[PDB]
Amino acid sequence: TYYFIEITIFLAILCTIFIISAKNPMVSILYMIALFVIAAMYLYLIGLGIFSLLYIMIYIGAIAVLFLFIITLLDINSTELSVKSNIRDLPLVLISLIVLTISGLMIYSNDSILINKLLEAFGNDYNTIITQDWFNIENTTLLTTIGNVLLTNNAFILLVLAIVLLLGIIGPISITMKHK
Amino acid sequence: TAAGISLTGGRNRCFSEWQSFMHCTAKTDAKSRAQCLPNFEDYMECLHHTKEKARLREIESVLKQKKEGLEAPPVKVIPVKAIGLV
Amino acid sequence: IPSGALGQKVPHVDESHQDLLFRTSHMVEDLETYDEDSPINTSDANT
Amino acid sequence: MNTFIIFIILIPIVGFALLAVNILLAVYKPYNEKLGTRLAFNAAFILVAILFLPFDLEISTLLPYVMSIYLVSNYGFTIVLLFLLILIIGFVYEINTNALKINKHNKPNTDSLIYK
Amino acid sequence: MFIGTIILVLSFLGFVFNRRNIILAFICLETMLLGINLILLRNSVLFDDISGSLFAIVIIILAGVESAIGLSLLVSYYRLRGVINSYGI
Amino acid sequence: TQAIWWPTYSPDQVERQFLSQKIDPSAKTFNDLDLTPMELPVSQLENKEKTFVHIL
Amino acid sequence: AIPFEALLPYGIIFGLLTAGGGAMQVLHVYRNGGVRDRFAIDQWDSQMMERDLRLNGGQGRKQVDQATAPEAFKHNHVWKSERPLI
Amino acid sequence: MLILAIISLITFVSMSKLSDNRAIIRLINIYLILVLVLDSFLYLLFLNNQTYTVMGELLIFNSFTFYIDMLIYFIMIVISSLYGYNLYNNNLYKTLFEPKKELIILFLINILGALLIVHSNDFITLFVAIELQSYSIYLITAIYNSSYKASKASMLYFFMGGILSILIAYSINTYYSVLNSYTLHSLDSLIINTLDLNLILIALSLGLLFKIGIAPLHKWLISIYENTPILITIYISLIPKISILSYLVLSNISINSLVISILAILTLLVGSVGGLLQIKIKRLLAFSGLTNAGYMMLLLLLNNNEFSYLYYITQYSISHLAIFMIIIFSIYYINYINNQYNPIIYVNQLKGLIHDNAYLVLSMAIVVFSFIGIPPLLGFFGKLNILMSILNNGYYFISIVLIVASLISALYYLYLLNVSIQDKNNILINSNETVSSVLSYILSSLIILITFGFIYNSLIIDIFNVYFN
Numbered sequence A: 001t002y003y004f005i006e007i008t009i010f011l012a013i014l015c016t017i018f019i020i021s022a023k024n025p026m027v028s029i030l031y032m033i034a035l036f037v038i039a040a041m042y043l044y045l046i047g048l049g050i051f052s053l054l055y056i057m058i059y060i061g062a063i064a065v066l067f068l069f070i071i072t073l074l075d076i077n078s079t080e081l082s083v084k085s086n087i088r089d090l091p092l093v094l095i096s097l098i099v100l101t102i103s104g105l106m107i108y109s110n111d112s113i114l115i116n117k118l119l120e121a122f123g124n125d126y127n128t129i130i131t132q133d134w135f136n137i138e139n140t141t142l143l144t145t146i147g148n149v150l151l152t153n154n155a156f157i158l159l160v161l162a163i164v165l166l167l168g169i170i171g172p173i174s175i176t177m178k179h180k
Numbered sequence B: 001t002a003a004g005i006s007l008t009g010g011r012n013r014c015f016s017e018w019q020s021f022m023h024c025t026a027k028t029d030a031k032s033r034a035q036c037l038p039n040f041e042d043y044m045e046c047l048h049h050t051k052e053k054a055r056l057r058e059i060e061s062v063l064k065q066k067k068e069g070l071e072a073p074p075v076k077v078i079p080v081k082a083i084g085l086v
Numbered sequence C: 001i002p003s004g005a006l007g008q009k010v011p012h013v014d015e016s017h018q019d020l021l022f023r024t025s026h027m028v029e030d031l032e033t034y035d036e037d038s039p040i041n042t043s044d045a046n047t
Numbered sequence D: 001m002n003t004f005i006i007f008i009i010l011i012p013i014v015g016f017a018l019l020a021v022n023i024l025l026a027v028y029k030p031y032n033e034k035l036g037t038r039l040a041f042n043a044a045f046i047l048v049a050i051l052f053l054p055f056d057l058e059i060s061t062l063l064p065y066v067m068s069i070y071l072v073s074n075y076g077f078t079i080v081l082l083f084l085l086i087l088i089i090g091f092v093y094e095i096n097t098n099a100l101k102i103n104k105h106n107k108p109n110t111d112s113l114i115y116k
Numbered sequence E: 001m002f003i004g005t006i007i008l009v010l011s012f013l014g015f016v017f018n019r020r021n022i023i024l025a026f027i028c029l030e031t032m033l034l035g036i037n038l039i040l041l042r043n044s045v046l047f048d049d050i051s052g053s054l055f056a057i058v059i060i061i062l063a064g065v066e067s068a069i070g071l072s073l074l075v076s077y078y079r080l081r082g083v084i085n086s087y088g089i
Numbered sequence F: 001t002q003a004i005w006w007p008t009y010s011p012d013q014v015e016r017q018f019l020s021q022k023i024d025p026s027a028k029t030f031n032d033l034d035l036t037p038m039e040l041p042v043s044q045l046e047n048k049e050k051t052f053v054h055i056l
Numbered sequence G: 001a002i003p004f005e006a007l008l009p010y011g012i013i014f015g016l017l018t019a020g021g022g023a024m025q026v027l028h029v030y031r032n033g034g035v036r037d038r039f040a041i042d043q044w045d046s047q048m049m050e051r052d053l054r055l056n057g058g059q060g061r062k063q064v065d066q067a068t069a070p071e072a073f074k075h076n077h078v079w080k081s082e083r084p085l086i
Numbered sequence H: 001m002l003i004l005a006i007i008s009l010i011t012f013v014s015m016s017k018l019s020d021n022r023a024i025i026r027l028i029n030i031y032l033i034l035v036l037v038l039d040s041f042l043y044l045l046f047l048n049n050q051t052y053t054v055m056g057e058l059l060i061f062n063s064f065t066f067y068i069d070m071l072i073y074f075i076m077i078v079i080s081s082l083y084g085y086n087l088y089n090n091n092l093y094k095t096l097f098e099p100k101k102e103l104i105i106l107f108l109i110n111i112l113g114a115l116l117i118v119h120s121n122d123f124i125t126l127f128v129a130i131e132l133q134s135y136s137i138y139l140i141t142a143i144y145n146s147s148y149k150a151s152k153a154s155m156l157y158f159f160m161g162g163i164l165s166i167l168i169a170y171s172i173n174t175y176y177s178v179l180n181s182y183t184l185h186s187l188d189s190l191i192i193n194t195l196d197l198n199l200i201l202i203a204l205s206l207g208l209l210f211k212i213g214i215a216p217l218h219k220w221l222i223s224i225y226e227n228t229p230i231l232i233t234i235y236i237s238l239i240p241k242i243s244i245l246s247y248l249v250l251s252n253i254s255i256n257s258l259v260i261s262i263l264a265i266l267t268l269l270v271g272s273v274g275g276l277l278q279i280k281i282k283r284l285l286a287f288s289g290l291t292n293a294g295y296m297m298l299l300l301l302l303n304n305n306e307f308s309y310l311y312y313i314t315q316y317s318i319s320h321l322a323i324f325m326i327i328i329f330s331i332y333y334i335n336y337i338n339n340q341y342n343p344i345i346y347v348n349q350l351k352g353l354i355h356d357n358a359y360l361v362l363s364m365a366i367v368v369f370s371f372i373g374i375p376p377l378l379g380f381f382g383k384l385n386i387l388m389s390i391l392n393n394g395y396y397f398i399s400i401v402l403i404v405a406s407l408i409s410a411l412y413y414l415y416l417l418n419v420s421i422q423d424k425n426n427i428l429i430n431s432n433e434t435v436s437s438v439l440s441y442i443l444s445s446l447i448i449l450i451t452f453g454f455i456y457n458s459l460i461i462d463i464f465n466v467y468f469n
């Protein structure tokens, strides 16, 4: 049970390709819900069990529900993935795939050197040593510290965020009412 | 801010190297910053472990080519079922 | 002749530019009449 | 290897088994008579699920606070009070505007009977 | 960093070469935000701090609000045109 | 697949597939008894949509 | 008055959940070795449980009380080596 | 005090009827005036470039940012006067210039999000404020939803703002992955030498800059500015420009960058020669904004650019504001009103404007020659003080490209003049109803600033010398 992270990486690739090539618009949206589940798997896998259920609650249970709710009672035309339509795209898809992929891998590195910048992204092989220290006396888990720092050090960010939630109330109402 | 706050609300893993670098930067003005280059280096490889990865690759390159391998007090691996068995 | 900052021929836009041959022309989004919002083009829009 | 994951994998085994039992067991035998544009909708239908989400995002924003409630005592309390009241004002916007109503288009035609 | 980078890149290119409908563009936007989340939360775990977790919990809420705003924007796009084209807006 | 209660394919049926219709000429067909058998063999609605109402 | 027949399927629901809870409690106590479960475990108490598995010798929560620790206790100490996190 | 206005306002607007909207805007207009007059004495806080950080190194308040918020309030007073006052009392201008119920809500929320960018110190304050102002521009674009062009423009602006917000988020977390930090106060003159922060900080600046309309990705914004109605587009052209540029000028993370110099050369080129053969007045008027944002991308390369910036900002703001208000006024004299949201489109429709209200053409000529940079007017000293910073700091090819770009851009500025001073057959003699006293006084104030504002240059340089040094 070593290669779990590699498996989630591969399954996420495959799920995005099934997102962007799908018969029916909501077959594509169910593949997105599956990608959210693969994400939450990776987040529990890395050690963040809190966030995975936050993803399942907020992204799956509200955003995907809103999205499916939109696709139901609105009319959306769709062409399917013809080969006549989209292999005119493929040479720039290949060039931009390799370039954007390498370039996203580039900025984790500090060299003057171009491909020493690149292959330090693959210098991964060393197993981190986890030590126990007995300095912490209480059950401050991660949600507790998020609640301490949203509320003391970044209280202003929480209140500007309240203004953003207010805007998310006012705006959709203001569009779709047709006042008398 | 949340400058040095860790997941448990304590100090993070590289807090002490950062606080040494800020102790450096507090008592210096510019034109005199070239002397707190080591503290910053100590901070950066605290973050990313670049020099330790280089050192461990240098030692693993040598232990791969030995027929003898390891003549040392070795290290044991256990299953999680057997931490205090014997 | 109306001119267009380089001495070019530009169209004088009267009310006679929104018919149904001027409907969905081939053009740049500049130098194009047939606006989609016009009191002769909507003309019982949500009825 | 806990008793948590046998559940996660075993509930599908329950389902896969039962719909197998029926598909394996029952008659298919269909035909034409057995087998068998778009409508418009009011604004409150789409509105209930669009404005649902900003209240849901507030309810899970209270969730970091109510776990940290002892540590931020007297101070995070007032920050949360201000947060809640800022969102109560957008809610009183929403119910003063009568947004979520679907209202009936035909009245008793109140206008009186005059003559000549 | 690999999973977040590749979901962001594949999500971006699926957004860019979308010619088939409009809601693929929405869901490719949301999966881009997911990939940004993945990269940041991994960095927070590796650096032993909450501040990446702070930016991640804030960008969750901002992604939700942008989905609500933009889908009401699509509904108002649809009000006057009872059809959504396949080629795009 | 035959060892089931549903009507499985017979093995002598692929055998009959290679065989084909060779009919007796010294017989009497449909026109004996007076019948002849039956033989085996986007741009304008967008703009009309532009005058309807879709959200009330 | 009271229909016994109406409340008998409630009686079987009550009995099934009662017998399930009782059988499950005895299964938990048999797993622990005669004591109750720990229903909310800290990071501190997680580290304390692995330390006591190290100290008692093999057993789960045998809970030795000895004066001074044994000989193999100084040598059976564990670090955890976690994979690259690709 | 914006927060007070929003909190008060949505409470008050939910209970008003739609008959009261215009008067509500008048109220807010006067409110903002007394926030300028009664509260600007806070400039005394910022003596000798004393800088504060507020909310735990979260917001940064210096005198630069104080000037930017004063400028944003002045412009909001002008724009809210344009919505809250009638042009004429016809049954015509009531069906043309009509505010929605929730327009001033979105205005004040956007002014809030625009202030929290310039006042920002950390990256998550920057992010949250960028999305606050971005959602507000989405909804200000989409609020006149009975319009095909504005609906299509709001959808386009949603997707193109979503990409360039995810690029900013990628750059921020990419900066976080190499430095356990959120501040650019972290950088402090030594880290930049021993660390390659070039690709990070330049990708940050680029993702911020493509929302302004810099040159490879300019056409989508020109289409949004042509498709929005004439009152909305004077606000959404100005406010993201001055907010995002006032962020990127205060934070000097692209000093002597080769990419920003490439895109500044390209911006000056494609804006000058892009709007030459164009016949719509908002198109013509938006490529002017493209060039004048290029002149700011130039100052992004600079260290210590706060005079040239702030002078050319209030220059461009007054000139921009006045040239949109003049073509609001010319709608009374055109022979052809189409398109209720956008009643004047083609620039040949103002053709006989010297024979009907010649002093409107005097107004127009003054602000157009200040766009060109003619020395008695205020735009000249803006271009002059930009050149004094470009040449001081070694950008010699950039200087000649600036000069050629200004010469090419003078053609389509003067094309407005060339159209308006011309013969027309049927001229006005006698018109019964008058333009708004309150609202033509604003245009005259904006002209008198442009013409006679060179008087106060030495006063302004002395007050500059004390509060920023």
Ligand SMILES: CCCCC/C=C/C/C=C/CCCCCCCC(=O)O[C@H](COC(=O)CCCCCCCCCCCCCCC)COP(=O)(O)OCC[N+](C)(C)C
Pocket (backbone or CB within 6 Å): H036, H037, H040, H041, H043, H063, H066, H067, H070, H071, H074, H307, H310, H311, H314, H315, H449, H452, H453, H454, H456, H460, H463, H464, H467
């Ligand atoms: C009761 C008063 C209430 C407050 C009124 C404030 C309104 C804000 C309006 C902004 C746009 C209108 C232009 C006004 C320019 C003001 C120049 C100035 O003074 O700005 C200063 C220099 O600006 C700089 O570097 C460069 C600034 C460049 C200015 C270039 C335009 C020149 C011509 C117009 C300005 C002169 C008009 C004077 C007309 C009598 C920098 O900030 P301060 O802390 O010293 O401000 C203090 C102003 N107080 C005392 C009135 C609060």
